[PDB]
A paper describes a structure:
The crystal structure of AnkH shows that it contains four N-terminal ankyrin repeats, followed by a cysteine protease-like domain and an α-helical C-terminal domain. AnkH is an α/β-fold protein and contains a total of 21 α-helices and seven β-strands. The N-terminal domain contains ankyrin repeats with four helix-turn-helix repeats (α1 to α8, residues 1 to 122). The ARD is followed by a 4-turn-long helix α9 and an extended β-hairpin (β1 to β2, residues 123 to 162) leading to the middle domain. This domain (residues 163 to 361) contains a central 5-stranded antiparallel β-sheet, β3 to β7, and is extended by the presence of helix α12. The C-terminal domain (residues 362 to 461) contains a five-helix bundle and packs tightly together with α9 and the following β-hairpin, forming one domain. The N-terminal and C-terminal domains pack end to end into a crescent shape. The middle domain forms an independent insertion attached to the side of the ARD that typically functions as the protein binding surface. The structure-based sequence identity between the aligned regions of CPLD and XopD is only ∼12%; nevertheless, three β-strands and two α-helices are structurally similar between AnkH and XopD, with His243, Asp258, and Cys324 of AnkH superposed on the catalytic triad of XopD. The orientation of these three side chains in AnkH deviates from the active configuration, and a small rearrangement of the triad side chains has to occur to attain the active state.
Among the 8 core effectors, AnkH is the only one that is conserved among all bacterial pathogens harboring the Dot/Icm T4SS, including Coxiella burnetii and Rickettsiella grylli. While many L. pneumophila effectors are dispensable for intracellular growth of the pathogen in macrophages, we have previously shown that the AnkH ARD-containing effector is one of very few effectors required for intracellular replication in macrophages and amoebae and for intrapulmonary proliferation in the A/J mouse model. We determined that the host nuclear protein La-related protein 7 (LARP7), which is a component of the 7SK small nuclear ribonucleoprotein (snRNP) complex, interacts with AnkH in the host cell nucleus. We conclude that the AnkH-LARP7 interaction impedes interaction of LARP7 with 7SK snRNP, which would block transcriptional elongation by Pol II, leading to host global transcriptional reprogramming and permissiveness to L. pneumophila.
Author numbering: 0 to 342, 348 to 464
């Protein structure tokens, strides 16, 4: 074709004057959904970006998802492009449509240089930390609905507990594993740490392979990278099908499909096959798998025939029929990849999975509790809302661990300045009508030595 986007992708300096005479604006959204500056950021082309900035393009204009050019430069860990953008007015606290600010991914990936560069130009870390913690809590505790967090301007923005973000999920799962094997309370699991390490490695590669999905036109270097990763011992392939993320794991001659949703009613959650035609696992296979649009028939039948997937084993992973199973599908990668490395004993893998999940629940809760006492009034209100959501939705009065979490939470929700949270709940689920969860909340309050003085009593 003939396009400024195709010029940028092909590393050719565009003839900006010819495109302007043709009636185009250098801020226009191109055929790939991006602006010329966002194309420069994606392709790490700093000279073309300098040219565009010289022609006074909107340096903060995002794509439909809300990713500003600074978002794209930072997600690439490109220090020069990030510095160029920040020099000419890129908002360091811009957030995407889901509320994901510029700092989130560098925080999750431990990229200290770009984090300090963003700090120097005004980025606020609390926004990223609160977003990460709220999303992790909504996923781990299976919370429903929304909650309001505080942006870098002290204003409340909505956050969807149920919204699934794939790259965010991969990053947060890798970081959670890193924190898990580094906790004192998990030293008795030291012998299991090497295998986990490998899993983390795979997750890293997965992140890379996912980022290339945003590129408008993959080239020689992307295919060289895919060829390099096809030689890695372990491979994690998340696939999008029917609005859900299902997961595949390759480890040497073994292949594994993880789908805890509707399909698990027919197949079970986790199936492990032997790859009898490894010669079909090529660059073109990975491209069809990750970078072309495929239907359910491709992921549930075509790949079995192409790779010659011989059924070998299965894992009794619990189904997730209600809601969105993408998060659970990504979580289940850890025990499945562990078991595949063991090659067969799902016992240790499932026990490790349960221990990791419960530890991460308690870690996120402790993060919230610790940040409450150091927080501003608005962030305190947000954290109190999150804790009340945890208490009301995820704590059963017959579970002693849930009761310990409820004690932790009620230490904060009983303060006079925040009791209103509990008040609201008891107003909307105990006085107006006695729901099941309102009854459970009354029971929990009584088992912690708390009389709400509301006129309603539990019904055992």
């Amino acid at each position: 074709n003939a396009s400024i986007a195709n010029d940028i992708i092909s590393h050719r300096m565009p003839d900006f004057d010819a495109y302007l005479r043709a009636g185009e604006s250098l801020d226009d959204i191109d055929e790939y959904g991006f602006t010329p500056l966002i194309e420069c950021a994606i392709t790490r082309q700093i000279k073309i970006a300098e040219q565009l900035i010289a022609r006074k393009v909107d340096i903060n204009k995002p794509d439909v998802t809300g990713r500003t050019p600074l978002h794209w430069a930072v997600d690439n860990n490109d220090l020069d492009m990030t510095k160029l953008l920040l020099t000419y007015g890129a908002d360091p606290n811009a957030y995407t449509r889901n509320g994901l600010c510029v700092l989130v991914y560098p925080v999750l990936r431990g990229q200290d240089a770009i984090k300090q560069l963003l700090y120097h130009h005004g980025a606020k870390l609390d926004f990223a930390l609160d977003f990460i913690n709220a999303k992790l809590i909504g996923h781990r505790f299976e919370l429903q609905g929304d909650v309001d967090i505080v942006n870098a301007k002290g204003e409340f923005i909505e956050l969807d507990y149920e919204g699934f973000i794939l790259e965010f999920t991969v990053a947060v799962v890798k970081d959670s594993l890193r924190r898990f094997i580094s906790s004192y309370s998990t030293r008795h699991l030291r012998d299991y740490f090497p295998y986990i390490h490998n899993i983390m490695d795979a997750f890293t590669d997965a992140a890379e392979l996912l980022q290339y999905q945003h590129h408008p036109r993959l080239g020689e270097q992307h295919f060289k990278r895919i060829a390099a990763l096809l030689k890695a011992p372990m491979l994690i392939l998340p696939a999008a099908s029917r609005g859900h993320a299902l997961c595949f794991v390759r480890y040497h001659q073994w292949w594994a499909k993880i789908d805890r949703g509707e399909n698990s009613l027919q197949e079970g959650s986790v199936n492990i096959y032997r790859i009898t035609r490894p010669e079909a696992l090529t660059i073109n296979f990975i491209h069809d798998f990750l970078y072309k649009k495929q239907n359910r028939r491709y992921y549930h039948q075509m790949i079995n025939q192409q790779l010659g997937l011989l059924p070998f084993a299965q894992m009794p992973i619990s189904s997730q029929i209600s809601g969105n199973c993408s998060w659970a599908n990504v979580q289940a990668v850890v025990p499945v990849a562990y078991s595949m490395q063991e090659l067969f004993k799902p016992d240790v893998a499932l026990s490790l999975y349960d221990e990791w999940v419960e530890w991460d629940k308690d870690r996120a809760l402790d993060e919230c509790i610790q940040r409450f006492y150091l927080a501003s009034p608005e962030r305190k209100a947000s954290i109190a809302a999150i804790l009340g959501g945890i208490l009301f939705q995820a704590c059963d009065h017959a579970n002693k661990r849930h009761l310990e979490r409820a004690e932790k939470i009620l230490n904060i929700l009983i303060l006079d300045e925040y009791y209103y949270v509990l008040s609201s709940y008891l107003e909307e689920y105990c006085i107006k009508r006695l729901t099941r969860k309102g009854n459970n909340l009354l029971k929990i309050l009584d088992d912690c030595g708390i009389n709400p003085n509301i006129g309603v009593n539990p019904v055992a």
